[PDB]
Design a protein around this ligand. Sequence first.
Ligand SMILES: NC(=O)c1ccc[n+]([C@@H]2O[C@H](COP(=O)([O-])OP(=O)(O)OC[C@H]3O[C@@H](n4cnc5c(N)ncnc54)[C@H](OP(=O)(O)O)[C@@H]3O)[C@@H](O)[C@H]2O)c1
Ligand SMILES: NC(=O)c1ccc[n+]([C@@H]2O[C@H](COP(=O)([O-])OP(=O)(O)OC[C@H]3O[C@@H](n4cnc5c(N)ncnc54)[C@H](OP(=O)(O)O)[C@@H]3O)[C@@H](O)[C@H]2O)c1
Lengths: 237, 230
Amino acid sequence: MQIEGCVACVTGADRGLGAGLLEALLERGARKVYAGVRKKECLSDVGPRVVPVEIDITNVEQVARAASRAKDITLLINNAGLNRMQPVLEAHDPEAARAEMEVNYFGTLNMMRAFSPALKSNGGAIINVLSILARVALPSMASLSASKAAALRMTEGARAELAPHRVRVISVLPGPIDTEMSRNVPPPKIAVREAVDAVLAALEGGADEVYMGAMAQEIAQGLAADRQALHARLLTP
Amino acid sequence: MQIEGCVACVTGADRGLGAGLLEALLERGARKVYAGVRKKGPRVVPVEIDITNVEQVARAASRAKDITLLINNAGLNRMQPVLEAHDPEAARAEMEVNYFGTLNMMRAFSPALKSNGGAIINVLSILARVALPSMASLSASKAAALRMTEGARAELAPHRVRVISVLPGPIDTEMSRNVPPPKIAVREAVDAVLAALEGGADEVYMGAMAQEIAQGLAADRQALHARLLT
Ligand SMILES: NC(=O)c1ccc[n+]([C@@H]2O[C@H](COP(=O)([O-])OP(=O)(O)OC[C@H]3O[C@@H](n4cnc5c(N)ncnc54)[C@H](OP(=O)(O)O)[C@@H]3O)[C@@H](O)[C@H]2O)c1
Ligand SMILES: NC(=O)c1ccc[n+]([C@@H]2O[C@H](COP(=O)([O-])OP(=O)(O)OC[C@H]3O[C@@H](n4cnc5c(N)ncnc54)[C@H](OP(=O)(O)O)[C@@H]3O)[C@@H](O)[C@H]2O)c1
């Protein structure tokens, strides 16, 4: 499908990749964008074609309220996410793993469940912004990795359930992007503008598993070519 | 790491694969097995462990400081899709057992394993690597557990603890009563889990279905996805 004339909802639209997606959807001729934010005061772009909607994706009531006000949706981009950057065992915060799972898996799932009825009725597409770490843990962020892997399996199951109803479901798997989430990750990081372009370009390709950037491509190719060798290298300190 | 002489703990020891593992560990010479069960010979120490109950997990670890082998076998499959689930919280229930419960066990027992040296085997599922639509929330919880196993493997490798995942297809236990044949016999599954300690692989695929899916996810990925999902 085309961006031109679509009715989109983007979560996490107040900053980072989501703010970039909001701006690009507008520039490329979207009819309307529901800009999901946790505090409407956080949004700097509230002009024409933008409908700010309060959505903490972990809050089932806010998600339901948003879906009921967005029955014209044709494109959902599940962009909101949380990376607490902690290992699974030696975590400073033992509850961080549960918080990441709550946003990246249960929150995305809440959005899928609430917005799918309208997408089935209208036709359309869902893009889930996951991570290359859905495919392999980085030990220092292994609980983020686990939450994104759960979200990838969920995206596969949702694709199967929605395929007979003409709703396309795409996963995008990036390496590091230059946003506040990765403030502590050393460069090189993908520029937001490049990441925005790659997310939106996924609608024009045929792949439902889309790797963004060199790191993500290298990991996917290495896992296919020699899974065991790559694991032994990446997971032995 | 031999089973002979080891001190093992296996969860889910009252039925299915865990009960088979308890029996085989004894036959193969474990000097002591902490048999984790939800409702309770001299080499067997029954221990009350709901793996989602952090206090029961902590109490069990405090009474198992001699452990050298942990087998995280307990698991739950609600067999529901992610979107049209009959129970909207089935996904949360599976995540609680298969991810958070296994994580609780890893966190509580790792200190003694680091002190004694030893190994952890996590019984996951081939569905950690790809969803089946009718069981996609089970798949998600096992994929979470697989990434967690990888992270734990890296954290524990410098501290004399080997961490292995086992990824079976269907096994002939109560969990898979509604999965049609064919299913791996419990005894074959037991042999494959315990043989993992003598092999060098960090991921062990159990049975022909699991091996075929693993091969396809590396070498035939787009077509395998289409076959399972669309
Ligand atoms: N290196 C990277 O940055 C990187 C790499 C791979 C994948 N990704 C993924 O890319 C996506 C965008 O992240 P980013 O890089 O733009 O990070 P970011 O700058 O930290 O922005 C994260 C966004 O998610 C929102 N969010 C977090 N928890 C939320 C919740 N419970 N409900 C609603 N919104 C919530 C934040 O809202 P508030 O402003 O209200 O906090 C913010 O808008 C995420 O899914 C992330 O996992 C990022
Ligand atoms: N086809 C299959 O059977 C299959 C396929 C792939 C992977 N696996 C995995 O193999 C492992 C063993 O399952 P199984 O085949 O032996 O199934 P099973 O016969 O149904 O046994 C499941 C076991 O898990 C225990 N358990 C569940 N929730 C628990 C909790 N909160 N705390 C403690 N114990 C809990 C059960 O305890 P109670 O008896 O007290 O309920 C039971 O001992 C699981 O991790 C499963 O996911 C099985």
